[PDB]
Amino acid sequence: PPIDPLPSLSRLMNNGVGKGKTREDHKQVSDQLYSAYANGVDIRKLVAIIGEDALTENDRRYLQFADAFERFFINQGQQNRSIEESLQIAWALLSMLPQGELKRISKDHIGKYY
Amino acid sequence: SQVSPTRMNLLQRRGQLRLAQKGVDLLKKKRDALVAEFFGLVREAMEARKALDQAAKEAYAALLLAQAFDGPEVVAGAALGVPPLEGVEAEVENVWGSKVPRLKATFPDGALLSPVGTPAYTLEASRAFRRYAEALIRVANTETRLKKIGEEIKKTTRRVNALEQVVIPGIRAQIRFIQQVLEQREREDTFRLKRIKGKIEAREAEEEGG
Known about the structure:
Chain A: Keywords: ATP synthesis, Hydrogen ion transport, Ion transport, Transport. Chain A: It comes from Thermus thermophilus (strain ATCC BAA-163 / DSM 7039 / HB27). Chain A: GO terms for molecular function: ATP binding; proton-transporting ATP synthase activity, rotational mechanism. Chain A: Produces ATP from ADP in the presence of a proton gradient across the membrane. The V-type beta chain is a regulatory subunit. Chain A: This is V-type ATP synthase beta chain. The structure is cut from a larger assembly and holds chains A (114 residues) and B (210 residues). With 114 residues, chain A is mainly α. Chain A has four helices and no strands. The two termini of chain A are 27 Å apart. With 210 residues, chain B is an all-alpha fold. Chain B is built from four helices and two strands, in the order ααββαα. In chain B, helix 1 packs antiparallel against helix 3. Chain A binds chain B through residues 45, 48-52, and chain B through 150, 153-154, 157-158, 160-162.
């Protein structure tokens, strides 16, 4: 399915969700996925404008997260994913970003799933 | 704050599409020419470079422990140093891909003319200076050509990228916005004209009734 969340904006995102009302890290992994993709797609603008690049090495990791979120996650065919399977593996793509550069998720959750 | 008018703006925005699309068409094949020829210079560059790099060094490296006291002798017979302020011959040239200057490395340095010293090596080292000079001209033109073709490439990808986002659909949405508001204005026209009709008939319906 092609879903693009960047022009997407929902009314509630912490209501009907929270610790034990969905999963404890549902509430945490919300805002995280959002700003993470953002800073990927952003680069691909500026690359044409000057040279053939527009990135360092601290940009290059957010770069691969716009490929990672892509055909792995967004694509799935029509297969039914479970609320577990979703956020679980959403933390295997978040291993490619520095954990010391995360500011949209709390630290006590870093220690629960890495 | 700043919003576009409809009646005044219309005529500008229709010719906007005429101006843009045609301009960019030929802009396209403008740089294409220049990069095709550029391959030719980069390849050809290194031809002389492999040949003369090795035959320069041939003698150099074989005159290091027979030199360091025959250094004196070799520099004496030979033609004195190239000037540090413009010893090379700089050329200015205006060309597309901005005004980039070029240059050729030819200067005097002599050849086969140092008197006294090591029988073979001295003279062979002096001659070798030429194989710096000459060889260096190739890289003298391609590394300056590199900076020119940088400008082009970057501006090229810039315009394409840009066009498909802000410009093109933006120059569209302007006609569209205009259009729709011109169009919708003409609901009030018809509605008013309706009530006008109603009056007219109502008047000829007081001759024949009430």
